[PDB]
Amino acid sequence: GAQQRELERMAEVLVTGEQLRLRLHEEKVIKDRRHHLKTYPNCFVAKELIDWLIEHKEASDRETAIKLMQKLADRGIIHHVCDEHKEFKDVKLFYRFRKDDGTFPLDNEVKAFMRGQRLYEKLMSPENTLLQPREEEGVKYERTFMASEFLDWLVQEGEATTRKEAEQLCHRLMEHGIIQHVSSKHPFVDSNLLYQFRMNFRRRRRLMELLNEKS
């Protein structure tokens, strides 16, 4: 129980950080920037991001905005572009998302959540209606999939090169609480059995959730 809850807290930070990284690229808060005759690619200015967080009503004041970003720095989501400041400071210093320079601190559980995120985005797209409601024993379940059909899809979509690899991915998703069997706890089996996502990758997190307990 405790370990699953801790992983879920980890997943909330990964999802929140990633949702933010994408918005800041689209808004051009992250871009290539000059300082002392050099160009620093894919970075943001700390003081500017604080301005932006307040403008977009993600934080009420600078003090709180800073706590939000310090959390992302502590969690390995962002870092100073030259690794010269562990503190997130409200000044003209440049910081970068670790995904954007290939320095993200990876482990097997992080990898699973990132795969899950990438999968779920596809399952939310207008062209994909694999996830379907199903009823079993007078109870209706939302957004279900048959295990076998989900493996077919993973290979079709290029998320796995083979069915074995697709099955292994699903075992990892199950292990880390990302998917679950419908109705009762059960392992993932390539089969007629029904599963659904347990982790929610759709919801737009409020950045203030980063100050939630044990985040």
DSSP track, 10-27: HHHHHHHHHHHHHHHHHT
- Token pair in block for residue 30: 């992250």
Q: Confirm if 156 and 171 have CB atoms less than 8 A apart.
A: no
Token digits of residue 151 = 């493996």
Asked if residue 83 lies in contact with residue 98, where contact means CB atoms within 8 angstroms, the answer is no
Helices (H), 143-200: 147-156, 163-175
Question: Which helix (H) or strand (E) element contains residue 142?
Answer: strand 139-146
Report how far residue 4's alpha carbon sits from residue 21's, in angstroms, rounded to the nearest whole number. 26
Technique employed here was X-ray
- Token pair listed for 110: 């992080």
| Interior angle at CA 207, CA 15 and CA 123, nearest 5 | 30
Instruction: Name the strand (E) or helix (H) holding 33.
Output: strand 31-35
Q: Which residues contact 187 (CB under 8 A, 6 or more apart)?
A: 171, 174, 181
Q: How far apart (Å, rounded) are the C-alpha atoms in residues 118 and 56?
A: 26
For the CA atoms of the chain, what is the radius of gyration? 20
Q: Domain 1-106+204-211, CATH 1.10.10.10 — does that match?
A: yes
Measured between alpha carbons, how far is 87 from 73 in angstroms, rounded to an integer?
8
In angstroms, what is the resolution? Answer: 1.5
How far, in Å, CA of 108 to CA of 114, rounded? 10
CATH fit for domain 108-197, picks 1.10.10.60, 1.10.10.10, 3.40.109.10, 3.40.50.2000: 1.10.10.10
| Lookup: tokens for 141 | 């379940």
- Domain borders along the chain are 1-106+204-211, 108-197
